[PDB]
Amino acid sequence: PSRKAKVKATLGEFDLRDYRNVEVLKRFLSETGKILPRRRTGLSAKEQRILAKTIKRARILGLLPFTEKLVRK
Amino acid sequence: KRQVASGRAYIHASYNNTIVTITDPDGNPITWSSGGVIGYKGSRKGTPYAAQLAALDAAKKAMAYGMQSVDVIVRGTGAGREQAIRALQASGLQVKSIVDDTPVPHNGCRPKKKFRKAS
Amino acid sequence: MRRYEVNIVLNPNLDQSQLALEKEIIQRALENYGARVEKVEELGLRRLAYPIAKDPQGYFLWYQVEMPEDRVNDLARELRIRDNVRRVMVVKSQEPFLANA
Amino acid sequence: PITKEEKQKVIQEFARFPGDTGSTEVQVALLTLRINRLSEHLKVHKKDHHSHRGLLMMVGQRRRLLRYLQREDPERYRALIEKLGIRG
RNA sequence: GUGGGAGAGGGUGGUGGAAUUCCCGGAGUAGCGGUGAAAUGCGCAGAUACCGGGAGGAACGCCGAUGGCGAAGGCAGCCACCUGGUCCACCCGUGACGCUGAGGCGCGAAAGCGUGGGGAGCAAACCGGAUUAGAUACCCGGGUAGUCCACGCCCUAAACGAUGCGCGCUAGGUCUCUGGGUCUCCUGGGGGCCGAAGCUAACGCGUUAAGCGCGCCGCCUGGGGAGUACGGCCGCAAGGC
Ligand SMILES: NC[C@@H]1O[C@H](O[C@H]2[C@@H](O)[C@H](O[C@@H]3[C@@H](O)[C@H](N)C[C@H](N)[C@H]3O[C@H]3O[C@H](CO)[C@@H](O)[C@H](O)[C@H]3N)O[C@@H]2CO)[C@H](N)[C@@H](O)[C@@H]1O
Ligand SMILES: NC[C@@H]1O[C@H](O[C@H]2[C@@H](O)[C@H](O[C@@H]3[C@@H](O)[C@H](N)C[C@H](N)[C@H]3O[C@H]3O[C@H](CO)[C@@H](O)[C@H](O)[C@H]3N)O[C@@H]2CO)[C@H](N)[C@@H](O)[C@@H]1O
Ligand SMILES: [K+]
Ligand SMILES: [K+]
Ligand SMILES: [Mg+2]
Ligand SMILES: [Mg+2]
Ligand SMILES: [Mg+2]
Ligand SMILES: [Mg+2]
Ligand SMILES: [Mg+2]
Ligand SMILES: [Mg+2]
Ligand SMILES: [Mg+2]
Ligand SMILES: [Mg+2]
Ligand SMILES: [Mg+2]
Ligand SMILES: [Mg+2]
Ligand SMILES: [Mg+2]
Ligand SMILES: [Mg+2]
Ligand SMILES: [Mg+2]
Ligand SMILES: [Mg+2]
Ligand SMILES: [Mg+2]
Ligand SMILES: [Mg+2]
Ligand SMILES: [Mg+2]
Ligand SMILES: [Mg+2]
Ligand SMILES: [Mg+2]
Ligand SMILES: [Mg+2]
Ligand SMILES: [Mg+2]
Ligand SMILES: [Mg+2]
Ligand SMILES: [Mg+2]
Ligand SMILES: [Mg+2]
Ligand SMILES: [Mg+2]
Ligand SMILES: [Mg+2]
Ligand SMILES: [Mg+2]
Ligand SMILES: [Mg+2]
Ligand SMILES: [Mg+2]
Ligand SMILES: [Mg+2]
Ligand SMILES: [Mg+2]
Ligand SMILES: [Mg+2]
């Protein structure tokens, strides 16, 4: 599980608390709209906990999705 | 009679049966088929073989509408899901894309006791 | 007096007149509820991850205000009165939390 | 809630001498502030029990402090109570 | 006291999307459903599968953890307001103000009760299909109270760590949550695992003691009879003590 690459490790400096920034937040979601587990995102407990609320806020704002379709099955 | 030639193919696969609906790109059904549409009656509808025959029957009745290429959408876990996929690929309809649309609630509704230890 | 961020999503189909009208009403409500506007970011028409009121897009507005706490909730309700207003989200402002800093 | 200026205002009100933060009078005054505020909150929100436990604890603390004051300097006790308008 | 922190702690209002059911419309036709296998059931008054629109109720997927918060029961979408507890740093103020706690008072999962709302899904009772020697059950199809909200009762439990609360003392190692610092490391508060000394009938416990001690509370004294009888108190009742 979580076998490819390091979501946080390849990325720049960013505000984890910014809901309006879509381009960066997209990277924390899977093929589906799911929030990636720590083992993928590479974040810490506090970081992750903040990320979740940020993403959920963005979803409610219609910036990020909730769920998505899986392709090429 | 339509002459559509490109459309969607919905494979709804549960443990008890497999039903396949070929539709136009607007979503409206052209034809459908299932385990019971072919000879099968009892538990045998849930068979992968039944899914094959159903998929093929749906595809045939679809090609009677002049259908050429379809996009596959899959719902539900059960045997003969992937068999329906494979049969559609071997059907004579070009399969463009395959997608899993399987519905899941976000903790929505209480399951029957059979499905419990969950919600 | 606490610091908040008002997010407002509007109808993408609004022309100049109707949109300027909506903004004037919004700012009149912000005035009427005692909210002082510090900084404003108008992002405008953007894609959505899912349709909102049948529309694939939305018109985004962002305000940073200083207003009395007791009135906040009420203000939001007022903003939701308008028919052409899709979403209102009022977030208590916070300092940025950086990673990879 | 209780902001900084409110709190300072009440501290410098009951302070025995300039610079007095933790003397019994100041403690009872602060406790009384929090208690009146919290009781006001529980006038509405009657279904908030968890906060009410807080109220109980604060009241206990205040009563203990006042008991100590009564034990030590009865006059300072009388003055404090008259000032804050407690007991009764 | 000042400054800084984490949190499903609690109450009120708002609000979001997924799914289920139902209604309307479109397209489409011979079944769907369900099981070990079936049947009841539903479907030619057009079901199932698919799309569009609408209504309503309830619960919040991923994050989510071997995680966090709470005195306990228990607490999980998001937003705002109101509000309880707690940790750390500075060493600033008061100067033993402390601990425990019979009674009292309050809180107290689920089910249950009262009045009034609500009712999608699930479902005691019940009505059916099947299974079986029989099947009052397990399996399948329906289904009322109930599950939901407000106010008021009930006070129970494997209400469990089956481990009362507070303080001091007695090797370390290792993972983790949250602070501070001279930031490889040190220092504090939580949560786990292995283990010195020691304890234990054993199992095991072992700085989160079941070790060494002190203070205060509650409780036990063979099994059945029996949490029964009688009495009293509580409760609308069920019933509880
Ligand atoms: N979001 C408001 C919440 O309301 C709660 O209580 C409220 C909610 O339970 C409920 O609000 C409405 C209700 O008016 C209306 N008749 C129906 C509506 N579905 C309800 O809303 C709620 O219903 C239930 C609650 O269990 C949830 O399952 C559902 O997600 C939620 N939307 O009725 C209550 C009174 O308005 C609590 N106060 C608190 O959690 C919070 O303030
Ligand atoms: N507790 C509820 C939650 O609080 C979070 O934030 C809470 C915490 O971050 C914060 O804790 C502060 C602490 O920073 C600060 N250093 C000291 C302060 N005493 C604490 O506050 C605490 O005590 C006070 C009474 O004095 C209470 O009113 C308050 O609820 C309690 N958290 O207080 C906040 C309010 O309680 C969430 N942001 C908020 O959305 C949510 O309501
Ligand atoms: K064992
Ligand atoms: K009586
Ligand atoms: Mg079947
Ligand atoms: Mg749940
Ligand atoms: Mg659960
Ligand atoms: Mg909470
Ligand atoms: Mg129809
Ligand atoms: Mg006919
Ligand atoms: Mg009909
Ligand atoms: Mg209804
Ligand atoms: Mg999980
Ligand atoms: Mg528990
Ligand atoms: Mg000093
Ligand atoms: Mg002195
Ligand atoms: Mg007692
Ligand atoms: Mg109860
Ligand atoms: Mg109940
Ligand atoms: Mg009732
Ligand atoms: Mg049922
Ligand atoms: Mg049943
Ligand atoms: Mg009744
Ligand atoms: Mg009734
Ligand atoms: Mg109640
Ligand atoms: Mg237990
Ligand atoms: Mg424990
Ligand atoms: Mg333990
Ligand atoms: Mg520790
Ligand atoms: Mg530690
Ligand atoms: Mg030993
Ligand atoms: Mg051990
Ligand atoms: Mg006993
Ligand atoms: Mg005996
Ligand atoms: Mg005897
Ligand atoms: Mg009994």
PDB file of N, CA and C (backbone and C1' of nucleotides) in Angstrom, chain B residues 2 16-17 19 21 26-30 32 34 36 42-43 45 75 104 106-108 110 113-114, chain E residues 18-19 26-29 31-35 37-38 47 49-51 58-61 121-123 140:
ATOM      1  N   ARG B   2     -33.578   3.108 -34.626  1.00  0.00           N
ATOM      2  CA  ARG B   2     -32.964   4.385 -34.286  1.00  0.00           C
ATOM      3  C   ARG B   2     -31.846   4.745 -35.256  1.00  0.00           C
ATOM      4  N   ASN B  16     -27.070 -12.140  -7.107  1.00  0.00           N
ATOM      5  CA  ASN B  16     -28.172 -12.980  -7.558  1.00  0.00           C
ATOM      6  C   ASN B  16     -28.463 -12.981  -9.050  1.00  0.00           C
ATOM      7  N   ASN B  17     -27.838 -12.066  -9.786  1.00  0.00           N
ATOM      8  CA  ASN B  17     -28.158 -11.866 -11.196  1.00  0.00           C
ATOM      9  C   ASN B  17     -27.280 -10.779 -11.788  1.00  0.00           C
ATOM     10  N   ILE B  19     -27.796  -7.753 -14.818  1.00  0.00           N
ATOM     11  CA  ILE B  19     -28.607  -7.162 -15.874  1.00  0.00           C
ATOM     12  C   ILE B  19     -27.801  -6.103 -16.624  1.00  0.00           C
ATOM     13  N   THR B  21     -27.924  -3.025 -19.550  1.00  0.00           N
ATOM     14  CA  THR B  21     -28.745  -2.104 -20.327  1.00  0.00           C
ATOM     15  C   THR B  21     -27.898  -1.289 -21.296  1.00  0.00           C
ATOM     16  N   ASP B  26     -27.451   9.843 -24.443  1.00  0.00           N
ATOM     17  CA  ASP B  26     -28.246  10.664 -23.537  1.00  0.00           C
ATOM     18  C   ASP B  26     -28.702   9.865 -22.315  1.00  0.00           C
ATOM     19  N   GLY B  27     -28.469   8.554 -22.341  1.00  0.00           N
ATOM     20  CA  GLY B  27     -28.791   7.696 -21.212  1.00  0.00           C
ATOM     21  C   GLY B  27     -30.024   6.827 -21.388  1.00  0.00           C
ATOM     22  N   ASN B  28     -30.863   7.172 -22.361  1.00  0.00           N
ATOM     23  CA  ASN B  28     -32.110   6.448 -22.612  1.00  0.00           C
ATOM     24  C   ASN B  28     -31.882   5.048 -23.175  1.00  0.00           C
ATOM     25  N   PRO B  29     -32.492   4.039 -22.544  1.00  0.00           N
ATOM     26  CA  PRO B  29     -32.309   2.633 -22.911  1.00  0.00           C
ATOM     27  C   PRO B  29     -32.778   2.318 -24.325  1.00  0.00           C
ATOM     28  N   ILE B  30     -31.948   1.571 -25.041  1.00  0.00           N
ATOM     29  CA  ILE B  30     -32.298   0.956 -26.312  1.00  0.00           C
ATOM     30  C   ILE B  30     -32.795  -0.456 -26.042  1.00  0.00           C
ATOM     31  N   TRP B  32     -32.158  -4.145 -23.217  1.00  0.00           N
ATOM     32  CA  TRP B  32     -31.618  -4.678 -21.974  1.00  0.00           C
ATOM     33  C   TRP B  32     -31.648  -6.203 -21.980  1.00  0.00           C
ATOM     34  N   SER B  34     -30.664  -9.928 -19.223  1.00  0.00           N
ATOM     35  CA  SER B  34     -30.323 -10.398 -17.891  1.00  0.00           C
ATOM     36  C   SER B  34     -30.155 -11.903 -17.856  1.00  0.00           C
ATOM     37  N   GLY B  36     -32.167 -13.926 -16.492  1.00  0.00           N
ATOM     38  CA  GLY B  36     -33.470 -14.523 -16.692  1.00  0.00           C
ATOM     39  C   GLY B  36     -34.046 -14.266 -18.069  1.00  0.00           C
ATOM     40  N   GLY B  42     -33.216 -19.888 -11.612  1.00  0.00           N
ATOM     41  CA  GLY B  42     -32.894 -19.877 -10.197  1.00  0.00           C
ATOM     42  C   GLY B  42     -31.588 -19.156  -9.922  1.00  0.00           C
ATOM     43  N   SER B  43     -30.835 -19.640  -8.941  1.00  0.00           N
ATOM     44  CA  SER B  43     -29.523 -19.073  -8.625  1.00  0.00           C
ATOM     45  C   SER B  43     -28.582 -18.970  -9.830  1.00  0.00           C
ATOM     46  N   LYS B  45     -28.740 -17.505 -12.476  1.00  0.00           N
ATOM     47  CA  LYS B  45     -28.640 -16.182 -13.087  1.00  0.00           C
ATOM     48  C   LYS B  45     -27.407 -15.436 -12.583  1.00  0.00           C
ATOM     49  N   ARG B  75     -21.696  -1.354 -12.138  1.00  0.00           N
ATOM     50  CA  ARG B  75     -22.196  -1.128 -10.793  1.00  0.00           C
ATOM     51  C   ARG B  75     -22.346  -2.432 -10.026  1.00  0.00           C
ATOM     52  N   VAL B 104     -22.297   4.089  -3.391  1.00  0.00           N
ATOM     53  CA  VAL B 104     -22.044   3.873  -1.980  1.00  0.00           C
ATOM     54  C   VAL B 104     -22.487   5.109  -1.214  1.00  0.00           C
ATOM     55  N   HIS B 106     -22.629   7.743   2.158  1.00  0.00           N
ATOM     56  CA  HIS B 106     -21.663   8.130   3.164  1.00  0.00           C
ATOM     57  C   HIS B 106     -22.366   7.976   4.512  1.00  0.00           C
ATOM     58  N   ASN B 107     -22.175   6.799   5.110  1.00  0.00           N
ATOM     59  CA  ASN B 107     -22.964   6.338   6.256  1.00  0.00           C
ATOM     60  C   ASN B 107     -24.489   6.612   6.254  1.00  0.00           C
ATOM     61  N   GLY B 108     -25.154   6.474   5.113  1.00  0.00           N
ATOM     62  CA  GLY B 108     -26.540   6.903   5.009  1.00  0.00           C
ATOM     63  C   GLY B 108     -27.698   6.174   5.685  1.00  0.00           C
ATOM     64  N   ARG B 110     -29.698   2.495   7.352  1.00  0.00           N
ATOM     65  CA  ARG B 110     -29.437   1.250   8.065  1.00  0.00           C
ATOM     66  C   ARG B 110     -29.734   0.027   7.216  1.00  0.00           C
ATOM     67  N   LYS B 113     -30.325  -6.802   8.555  1.00  0.00           N
ATOM     68  CA  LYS B 113     -29.488  -7.543   9.497  1.00  0.00           C
ATOM     69  C   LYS B 113     -28.405  -8.369   8.795  1.00  0.00           C
ATOM     70  N   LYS B 114     -28.730  -8.861   7.605  1.00  0.00           N
ATOM     71  CA  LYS B 114     -27.805  -9.640   6.793  1.00  0.00           C
ATOM     72  C   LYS B 114     -26.579  -8.820   6.398  1.00  0.00           C
TER      73      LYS B 114
ATOM     74  P     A E  18     -24.787  14.536  -4.684  1.00  0.00           P
ATOM     75  O5'   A E  18     -24.505  13.123  -4.005  1.00  0.00           O
ATOM     76  C5'   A E  18     -23.320  12.400  -4.303  1.00  0.00           C
ATOM     77  C4'   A E  18     -23.177  11.167  -3.444  1.00  0.00           C
ATOM     78  C3'   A E  18     -24.329  10.179  -3.461  1.00  0.00           C
ATOM     79  O3'   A E  18     -24.366   9.361  -4.614  1.00  0.00           O
ATOM     80  C1'   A E  18     -23.648  10.530  -1.243  1.00  0.00           C
ATOM     81  P     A E  19     -25.780   8.982  -5.279  1.00  0.00           P
ATOM     82  O5'   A E  19     -26.363   7.867  -4.305  1.00  0.00           O
ATOM     83  C5'   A E  19     -25.641   6.672  -4.055  1.00  0.00           C
ATOM     84  C4'   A E  19     -26.160   5.969  -2.830  1.00  0.00           C
ATOM     85  C3'   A E  19     -27.644   5.642  -2.826  1.00  0.00           C
ATOM     86  O3'   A E  19     -27.976   4.488  -3.580  1.00  0.00           O
ATOM     87  C1'   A E  19     -27.072   6.642  -0.777  1.00  0.00           C
ATOM     88  P     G E  26     -43.898  10.645 -20.407  1.00  0.00           P
ATOM     89  O5'   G E  26     -42.416  10.441 -20.967  1.00  0.00           O
ATOM     90  C5'   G E  26     -41.781  11.454 -21.734  1.00  0.00           C
ATOM     91  C4'   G E  26     -40.301  11.200 -21.904  1.00  0.00           C
ATOM     92  C3'   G E  26     -39.912   9.884 -22.554  1.00  0.00           C
ATOM     93  O3'   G E  26     -40.032   9.916 -23.964  1.00  0.00           O
ATOM     94  C1'   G E  26     -38.544  10.274 -20.665  1.00  0.00           C
ATOM     95  P     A E  27     -40.694   8.678 -24.743  1.00  0.00           P
ATOM     96  O5'   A E  27     -39.537   7.583 -24.781  1.00  0.00           O
ATOM     97  C5'   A E  27     -38.353   7.801 -25.532  1.00  0.00           C
ATOM     98  C4'   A E  27     -37.242   6.888 -25.083  1.00  0.00           C
ATOM     99  C3'   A E  27     -37.533   5.399 -25.173  1.00  0.00           C
ATOM    100  O3'   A E  27     -37.324   4.871 -26.471  1.00  0.00           O
ATOM    101  C1'   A E  27     -36.666   5.892 -23.039  1.00  0.00           C
ATOM    102  P     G E  28     -38.351   3.794 -27.083  1.00  0.00           P
ATOM    103  O5'   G E  28     -38.065   2.476 -26.237  1.00  0.00           O
ATOM    104  C5'   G E  28     -36.804   1.831 -26.307  1.00  0.00           C
ATOM    105  C4'   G E  28     -36.594   0.896 -25.145  1.00  0.00           C
ATOM    106  C3'   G E  28     -37.588  -0.244 -25.017  1.00  0.00           C
ATOM    107  O3'   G E  28     -37.290  -1.321 -25.885  1.00  0.00           O
ATOM    108  C1'   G E  28     -37.294   0.781 -22.914  1.00  0.00           C
ATOM    109  P     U E  29     -38.470  -2.237 -26.476  1.00  0.00           P
ATOM    110  O5'   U E  29     -38.695  -3.312 -25.328  1.00  0.00           O
ATOM    111  C5'   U E  29     -37.591  -4.019 -24.779  1.00  0.00           C
ATOM    112  C4'   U E  29     -38.034  -5.052 -23.777  1.00  0.00           C
ATOM    113  C3'   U E  29     -39.212  -5.927 -24.210  1.00  0.00           C
ATOM    114  O3'   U E  29     -39.076  -7.179 -23.550  1.00  0.00           O
ATOM    115  C1'   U E  29     -39.755  -4.870 -22.217  1.00  0.00           C
ATOM    116  P     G E  31     -39.122 -13.348 -19.482  1.00  0.00           P
ATOM    117  O5'   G E  31     -37.688 -12.792 -19.090  1.00  0.00           O
ATOM    118  C5'   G E  31     -37.266 -12.787 -17.737  1.00  0.00           C
ATOM    119  C4'   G E  31     -37.434 -11.420 -17.130  1.00  0.00           C
ATOM    120  C3'   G E  31     -36.901 -11.247 -15.722  1.00  0.00           C
ATOM    121  O3'   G E  31     -35.509 -11.041 -15.677  1.00  0.00           O
ATOM    122  C1'   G E  31     -39.071 -10.378 -15.824  1.00  0.00           C
ATOM    123  P     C E  32     -34.670 -11.710 -14.495  1.00  0.00           P
ATOM    124  O5'   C E  32     -34.831 -10.686 -13.286  1.00  0.00           O
ATOM    125  C5'   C E  32     -34.583  -9.299 -13.465  1.00  0.00           C
ATOM    126  C4'   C E  32     -35.276  -8.472 -12.412  1.00  0.00           C
ATOM    127  C3'   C E  32     -34.894  -8.767 -10.969  1.00  0.00           C
ATOM    128  O3'   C E  32     -33.697  -8.117 -10.579  1.00  0.00           O
ATOM    129  C1'   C E  32     -37.247  -8.649 -11.154  1.00  0.00           C
ATOM    130  P     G E  33     -32.551  -8.899  -9.769  1.00  0.00           P
ATOM    131  O5'   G E  33     -33.155  -9.106  -8.309  1.00  0.00           O
ATOM    132  C5'   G E  33     -33.677  -8.021  -7.557  1.00  0.00           C
ATOM    133  C4'   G E  33     -34.668  -8.504  -6.526  1.00  0.00           C
ATOM    134  C3'   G E  33     -34.144  -9.556  -5.562  1.00  0.00           C
ATOM    135  O3'   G E  33     -33.477  -8.969  -4.457  1.00  0.00           O
ATOM    136  C1'   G E  33     -36.235 -10.249  -6.444  1.00  0.00           C
ATOM    137  P     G E  34     -31.977  -9.394  -4.079  1.00  0.00           P
ATOM    138  O5'   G E  34     -32.187 -10.716  -3.234  1.00  0.00           O
ATOM    139  C5'   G E  34     -33.049 -10.705  -2.110  1.00  0.00           C
ATOM    140  C4'   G E  34     -33.671 -12.055  -1.889  1.00  0.00           C
ATOM    141  C3'   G E  34     -32.711 -13.228  -1.847  1.00  0.00           C
ATOM    142  O3'   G E  34     -32.039 -13.339  -0.609  1.00  0.00           O
ATOM    143  C1'   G E  34     -34.551 -13.772  -3.210  1.00  0.00           C
ATOM    144  P     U E  35     -30.506 -13.810  -0.553  1.00  0.00           P
ATOM    145  O5'   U E  35     -30.608 -15.393  -0.459  1.00  0.00           O
ATOM    146  C5'   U E  35     -31.304 -15.991   0.620  1.00  0.00           C
ATOM    147  C4'   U E  35     -31.436 -17.473   0.433  1.00  0.00           C
ATOM    148  C3'   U E  35     -30.153 -18.189   0.061  1.00  0.00           C
ATOM    149  O3'   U E  35     -29.375 -18.485   1.211  1.00  0.00           O
ATOM    150  C1'   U E  35     -31.907 -18.870  -1.383  1.00  0.00           C
ATOM    151  P     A E  37     -28.112 -21.389  -3.810  1.00  0.00           P
ATOM    152  O5'   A E  37     -29.329 -22.357  -4.135  1.00  0.00           O
ATOM    153  C5'   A E  37     -29.111 -23.629  -4.728  1.00  0.00           C
ATOM    154  C4'   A E  37     -30.377 -24.449  -4.756  1.00  0.00           C
ATOM    155  C3'   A E  37     -31.626 -23.720  -5.209  1.00  0.00           C
ATOM    156  O3'   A E  37     -31.699 -23.602  -6.617  1.00  0.00           O
ATOM    157  C1'   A E  37     -32.107 -24.964  -3.264  1.00  0.00           C
ATOM    158  P     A E  38     -32.698 -22.540  -7.286  1.00  0.00           P
ATOM    159  O5'   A E  38     -34.129 -23.032  -6.778  1.00  0.00           O
ATOM    160  C5'   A E  38     -35.236 -22.154  -6.646  1.00  0.00           C
ATOM    161  C4'   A E  38     -36.236 -22.704  -5.656  1.00  0.00           C
ATOM    162  C3'   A E  38     -37.509 -21.893  -5.476  1.00  0.00           C
ATOM    163  O3'   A E  38     -38.475 -22.185  -6.470  1.00  0.00           O
ATOM    164  C1'   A E  38     -36.619 -22.466  -3.353  1.00  0.00           C
ATOM    165  P     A E  47     -42.480   0.570 -15.498  1.00  0.00           P
ATOM    166  O5'   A E  47     -41.785  -0.073 -14.223  1.00  0.00           O
ATOM    167  C5'   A E  47     -42.474  -0.109 -12.987  1.00  0.00           C
ATOM    168  C4'   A E  47     -42.248  -1.411 -12.271  1.00  0.00           C
ATOM    169  C3'   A E  47     -40.805  -1.761 -11.969  1.00  0.00           C
ATOM    170  O3'   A E  47     -40.270  -1.064 -10.854  1.00  0.00           O
ATOM    171  C1'   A E  47     -41.890  -3.643 -12.869  1.00  0.00           C
ATOM    172  P     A E  49     -33.431  -1.451 -10.378  1.00  0.00           P
ATOM    173  O5'   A E  49     -32.652  -1.534 -11.763  1.00  0.00           O
ATOM    174  C5'   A E  49     -31.539  -2.399 -11.927  1.00  0.00           C
ATOM    175  C4'   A E  49     -30.983  -2.302 -13.323  1.00  0.00           C
ATOM    176  C3'   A E  49     -30.667  -0.899 -13.816  1.00  0.00           C
ATOM    177  O3'   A E  49     -29.433  -0.393 -13.351  1.00  0.00           O
ATOM    178  C1'   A E  49     -31.921  -2.011 -15.454  1.00  0.00           C
ATOM    179  P     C E  50     -29.328   1.155 -12.945  1.00  0.00           P
ATOM    180  O5'   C E  50     -29.619   1.918 -14.310  1.00  0.00           O
ATOM    181  C5'   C E  50     -28.659   1.936 -15.350  1.00  0.00           C
ATOM    182  C4'   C E  50     -29.002   2.970 -16.386  1.00  0.00           C
ATOM    183  C3'   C E  50     -29.333   4.362 -15.874  1.00  0.00           C
ATOM    184  O3'   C E  50     -28.195   5.128 -15.529  1.00  0.00           O
ATOM    185  C1'   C E  50     -30.916   3.728 -17.500  1.00  0.00           C
ATOM    186  P     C E  51     -28.336   6.341 -14.484  1.00  0.00           P
ATOM    187  O5'   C E  51     -29.045   7.486 -15.336  1.00  0.00           O
ATOM    188  C5'   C E  51     -28.440   7.983 -16.521  1.00  0.00           C
ATOM    189  C4'   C E  51     -29.334   8.960 -17.245  1.00  0.00           C
ATOM    190  C3'   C E  51     -29.887  10.100 -16.411  1.00  0.00           C
ATOM    191  O3'   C E  51     -28.960  11.140 -16.180  1.00  0.00           O
ATOM    192  C1'   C E  51     -31.626   9.173 -17.692  1.00  0.00           C
ATOM    193  P     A E  58     -35.577  12.934  11.101  1.00  0.00           P
ATOM    194  O5'   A E  58     -34.288  11.998  11.110  1.00  0.00           O
ATOM    195  C5'   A E  58     -34.333  10.702  11.690  1.00  0.00           C
ATOM    196  C4'   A E  58     -33.438   9.730  10.959  1.00  0.00           C
ATOM    197  C3'   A E  58     -31.943   9.923  11.142  1.00  0.00           C
ATOM    198  O3'   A E  58     -31.470   9.355  12.345  1.00  0.00           O
ATOM    199  C1'   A E  58     -32.427   9.594   8.855  1.00  0.00           C
ATOM    200  P     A E  59     -30.281  10.063  13.151  1.00  0.00           P
ATOM    201  O5'   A E  59     -28.981   9.651  12.329  1.00  0.00           O
ATOM    202  C5'   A E  59     -28.590   8.291  12.255  1.00  0.00           C
ATOM    203  C4'   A E  59     -27.534   8.054  11.205  1.00  0.00           C
ATOM    204  C3'   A E  59     -26.300   8.938  11.253  1.00  0.00           C
ATOM    205  O3'   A E  59     -25.362   8.533  12.238  1.00  0.00           O
ATOM    206  C1'   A E  59     -27.062   8.762   9.029  1.00  0.00           C
ATOM    207  P     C E  60     -24.179   9.521  12.697  1.00  0.00           P
ATOM    208  O5'   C E  60     -23.485   9.977  11.339  1.00  0.00           O
ATOM    209  C5'   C E  60     -22.082   9.859  11.139  1.00  0.00           C
ATOM    210  C4'   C E  60     -21.753   9.679   9.679  1.00  0.00           C
ATOM    211  C3'   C E  60     -20.498  10.397   9.193  1.00  0.00           C
ATOM    212  O3'   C E  60     -19.841   9.620   8.192  1.00  0.00           O
ATOM    213  C1'   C E  60     -22.410  11.242   8.051  1.00  0.00           C
ATOM    214  P     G E  61     -18.321   9.146   8.412  1.00  0.00           P
ATOM    215  O5'   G E  61     -17.943   8.420   7.049  1.00  0.00           O
ATOM    216  C5'   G E  61     -18.274   7.056   6.851  1.00  0.00           C
ATOM    217  C4'   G E  61     -17.969   6.618   5.447  1.00  0.00           C
ATOM    218  C3'   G E  61     -16.519   6.749   5.020  1.00  0.00           C
ATOM    219  O3'   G E  61     -15.741   5.643   5.442  1.00  0.00           O
ATOM    220  C1'   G E  61     -17.939   7.628   3.338  1.00  0.00           C
ATOM    221  P     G E 121     -38.524   2.946   3.020  1.00  0.00           P
ATOM    222  O5'   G E 121     -37.170   2.482   3.700  1.00  0.00           O
ATOM    223  C5'   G E 121     -35.973   2.344   2.957  1.00  0.00           C
ATOM    224  C4'   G E 121     -34.812   2.130   3.888  1.00  0.00           C
ATOM    225  C3'   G E 121     -34.943   0.952   4.838  1.00  0.00           C
ATOM    226  O3'   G E 121     -34.590  -0.290   4.258  1.00  0.00           O
ATOM    227  C1'   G E 121     -34.332   2.861   6.062  1.00  0.00           C
ATOM    228  P     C E 122     -35.382  -1.622   4.690  1.00  0.00           P
ATOM    229  O5'   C E 122     -34.970  -1.839   6.211  1.00  0.00           O
ATOM    230  C5'   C E 122     -33.629  -2.124   6.580  1.00  0.00           C
ATOM    231  C4'   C E 122     -33.443  -1.978   8.066  1.00  0.00           C
ATOM    232  C3'   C E 122     -34.218  -2.965   8.923  1.00  0.00           C
ATOM    233  O3'   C E 122     -33.540  -4.198   9.062  1.00  0.00           O
ATOM    234  C1'   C E 122     -34.490  -0.766   9.774  1.00  0.00           C
ATOM    235  P     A E 123     -34.363  -5.566   9.197  1.00  0.00           P
ATOM    236  O5'   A E 123     -35.339  -5.304  10.430  1.00  0.00           O
ATOM    237  C5'   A E 123     -35.150  -5.934  11.690  1.00  0.00           C
ATOM    238  C4'   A E 123     -35.962  -5.243  12.751  1.00  0.00           C
ATOM    239  C3'   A E 123     -37.310  -5.863  13.093  1.00  0.00           C
ATOM    240  O3'   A E 123     -37.197  -6.879  14.070  1.00  0.00           O
ATOM    241  C1'   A E 123     -37.555  -3.524  12.766  1.00  0.00           C
ATOM    242  P     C E 140     -32.289 -14.099   5.458  1.00  0.00           P
ATOM    243  O5'   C E 140     -33.518 -14.251   4.458  1.00  0.00           O
ATOM    244  C5'   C E 140     -33.292 -14.567   3.095  1.00  0.00           C
ATOM    245  C4'   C E 140     -34.583 -14.739   2.341  1.00  0.00           C
ATOM    246  C3'   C E 140     -35.572 -13.590   2.439  1.00  0.00           C
ATOM    247  O3'   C E 140     -35.274 -12.521   1.559  1.00  0.00           O
ATOM    248  C1'   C E 140     -36.699 -15.625   2.805  1.00  0.00           C
TER     249        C E 140
END
